């Protein structure tokens, strides 16, 4: 009882992109397989990094979403 | 300034659904077919519903994933 | 008894889009506020449309997906 | 086909899962960080594994989703 089988979908936070000409991104809370907190993000040429959600880093990105 | 009516993957904003037991949601911002913000999200019960981006809701969901 | 208008993520087959420069497309059977088969997709401009599972229309998308 | 250390979503087939009470998944094709399938899914309770696009055990997914 606690989840068996982890896989965080993206290991470590994936800030070597920028936020910039980004599209959409998703969060995800730390599940089982991912006790990590795990959020997906995209960009315009449909690919998906990922990013972290303790820092000021995403923070940007929510705020260029409210910019909007 | 900007357009309406053409696709957006949610029309309005799917508040009639409240933030608790939730598992993850995507942000879109206002696309082409989607002028307006487009914000998509996802409950335990992987389905899913939408939310807006301009107002203290969807801040209590990412503040809901702050607390973890 | 189930099966009437509910929430579609997509309303109606979106297949006014053409099957090319695709990059990934979601798959989701008819759920309870879906009744009908919902399944949306993405394209290399991360955008999203959607098409249909019941005819060779996506099997061109799936197919095309084999190819490589 | 594969450039040169790349950054795949899923690493290997998460076939651990058994196909059953999925509920809906993405099938997103070698990218240039995924040079390799990259298949990923969702089960009813709102999670992410993810599968192959090269054999039978995906075909029983798509093949279950058009039973109905």
Known sequence: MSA??????????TSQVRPRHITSLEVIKAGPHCPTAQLIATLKNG???C?????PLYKKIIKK???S
Do not use: G, P, S
């Open 51 to 55: 990013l972290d959600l303790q820092a």
């Open 4 to 13: 068996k089988e982890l896989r965080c979908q993206c290991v470590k936070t």
């Open 65 to 67: 979403l409210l910019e």
């Open 47 to 49: 690919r998906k990094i």
